[PDB]
Every structure is written in C-alpha cells, then in structure tokens.
Amino acid sequence: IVGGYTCGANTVPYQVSLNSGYHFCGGSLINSQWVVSAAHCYKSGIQVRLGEDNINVVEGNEQFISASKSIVHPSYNSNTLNNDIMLIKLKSAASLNSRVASISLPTSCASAGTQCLISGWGNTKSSGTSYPDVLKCLKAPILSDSSCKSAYPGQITSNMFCAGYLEGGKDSCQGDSGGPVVCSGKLQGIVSWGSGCAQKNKPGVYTKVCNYVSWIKQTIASN
Template sequence: MTLLESLHLNSLIIRVSLDFVQGRIVGGYTPSPNSVKYIVSLQSSKGQHFCSGSLVHKSWVLTAAHCNIGCMMVVAGDYTLGAYEGTEQYSKPLSLIPHPQYNRSTNNADIMLIKLGVPIELNRYVSLAPLPKQNAGLLAGSMCRVSGWGSTSHSGGLTPLTLRTVKLPIVSTSKCNSSNSFSGNITANMICAGSSTGGKDVCKGDSGGPLVCDGRVYGLVSWGNGCGDSRFPGVYTAVSRFLTKVNAKTYPEKKKSFYKNITQ
C-alpha cells in the first residue's frame, strides 16, 4: 500500500467511525477547568463525543468538514464528559455548512460552520474563540496548543473523559511535505504541528478541535498518519485561509458576511 493510499484509508476510518473520530491527546496535560472556554463537544444522538469545535459566535461553531455526520448535539461549557457540572449548555444545529471545496480524498478545505438552533450564552465558563487575520501565517517552531477529549495513550484509558491539552511546535510545510513525511500531500490550506522527538500528538483527531497559537485559533484538527510519530506531525486546517474566501453561490450573503465579520 502506498503512502497516499494509507493516508486516504486513515482519513476514511476517521470519517466513518465514531470510535476512531474520538480524539486521543497523547503526551498532554489537564488544563484548569473551563480554561479553554470556546471549545465545544459535538456529540451523537446517543451522547457520544465524536468531534470538537470552536464557538466563534453565540450562534455559530467552527469545526472540520469531516465531522459532518448529520444528527448531533453541540455542548458548550463542558469539562469532563459524562459528568454533570452545571456549566454545560446544549444546542442542536439548524444547519451544517461544509466548505464547498472540501475534498474527502485529499482532506483539503476540511472546514465547516455549524449554525446553532439556540444561541449559546456567553458567561464565565463560555467565551468566543479569537481568530487570526485572513491569510496570517505561522513561523516554524512557533509553540501552539491543541485541546480535546479522550485517552492519553493508544491503549485506552477513556475514563474520565476530562479535557486535555498538548503543546506542539509548528512544522514547516517543506519539512512536512518531504519524502520522509507526507510526500507532497500537504496543501497551502493545511498546517503541520508535532514534536520532533514524537510522543506528543492528537491521535485519530479529536477532529475539528482548535490549534491555538498566539492566543488565536489558527488550525482545526484534520488528519494524520499514526499517533505521536516524529516523522508524521498532525495536520490541521489553516483557518486563516478560509475566513473570507467563501463561495457566494453556495453560501448565502448572511453566511458570507459572517465569515468576514468574525475576523474583525
């Protein structure tokens, strides 16, 4: 099996199986309760967490396009999944709006907006995610952090499902695209981040979760090859590439304006 076939198979597994979509922060730490106030949990009709997202407006969530499974519940203000903490807010989506250029085969443009049926109330536990400017870039070596729910290792340990965070440096596109890594499969709409020594990563995604650099959500957990392998950093959708580049024919003017306004 070629590298491209392997990566494509991995992305397919992530998309179609809730067990594999569920994130697994490897080599991370537990942040203070409700310190990542903009992260939301996307849950199935049975209450199973399968993806994460970022609250960018009281009525809108930004996540990965491959998290589009139809029936879901958006939960804001959560910290430990499955434990009622009194800070949670729930909202069912009115619509799921994947980017029109999203490509399932290449994972390009893996970004989606979720319009919420009930607006989320902003309070001491929930706030909006700061976003970068349009086309803002990151220097290789810049330290970022990514958060999500799941086990701390490949072997399991899914209880308790407390939010975890891992710090990761940005990896240059040229290095990520080298023959020793993703061999040209990283597009300009993607960001790579991972430890040069391995052991720190987001395993199988916690798809759609925020990659935060300089206090802003620069990336969304998208895809990868394995977990914690120094040769294969995690791959994230570059949020700054999509803030104003929205197809007007696919997105109504209201949504187009929303993408523009959230950068201000």
C-alpha cells in the same frame, strides 16, 4: 491527545464537543451562534455541548444546544482532506460567560516556530486505546513546511500545516478531530489528520484557518 496534560476547568472556554448520542468530534465557538469544526466530522443530528470539562458528568456548567444547520466547505475533498472545514450554526445563542467564550479568527497566518495549544477528548494512547473524559491540552509548535511535507510526500496542500514534535510522544489523535489549535490567541488550526498518533516523524496535520477567514465571515453573515 497523547502526551498532553489535563487543562482544567474552563481554561479553553471556546472548546466544544460535538455529540450524536456520544462525543464524536471537537469544535471551536467563534461567536454566540457559530462553531467551526472539521468537514469530516459532518453528521446529521449534531448537539453541541459548551462549557464541558468531563463529557460523562454534567457539572452544572454546560449548555447543550442543537445545530440548526451545517455547511461543509464547497471544495472539501474527503479523500485528501483538503479543505477540511465546516461551520455549524446553533439553534439558540449560547450565553457567553467565563466558561464559554468565543475564540478569534486570525488577521494573518502564523509562522513556523509559533507555540499553539491543541485541546480535545480524543484517545490518549499511541499504542493502545484510552479515551479520557476530561479535556486534555498540548502546547506544540508549528513545524516547517519542509519538515511537514517530507513526513507526508505529495499530501500536504497550502491549506494544511503540521504542528507537534517529530520525536513523537505528544500529538493530537482520534476523537480530537474538529478541535482547536490556537496560537497567540487566534484560532489558526483545526485538528484534521495524522499517521496514527504521536509516532516519530509523524506530526499532526491541521486545517490552516487563515486561508478561510473571508469564506467564514461571508458564510456566517448570509446564514
């Protein structure tokens, strides 16, 4: 995350780290046995780490559980990143506590203007590379579809929204992919893509989760 701050211990308790020997993507816990992340984070052999703050230090608050299965959306397009969502089922149920909580799915979509919290362990340097080890947070608003589409012409679909600041400065970045965008206590977005990180006129693009709630609910119930 660039221009964000250190969240702190368990302030984003639904945050997950996807690990395949190292941390490669983020995710959101939606109930004791399921995690939603981005389809471009699919890898085989995923281990989910819950209650993580520093991904390089075990502080006795974690739960390391392997995935039993992954489901990438039927319409995921890896070229356009349209429908970039995937579900990961956990082998055993995580134990929910103060440090590990699930986030709720929305009943409606959020409006431009709404303030969201974006979190993750991705790069922190726009012009450079720095990978933090503690969780970073960023409060950003949903931008208007017009400001989003003028920034990426012919590339935004109804399944994507933009959030951030056009002045550049703060934004999601490499690593943070798969992570949550929570607005008014609901999981409304998933970090999906952007043009570099925090550049002027280049906000991040997020999967608009409100368009997949019936697919999520149906898929989890039959798997």
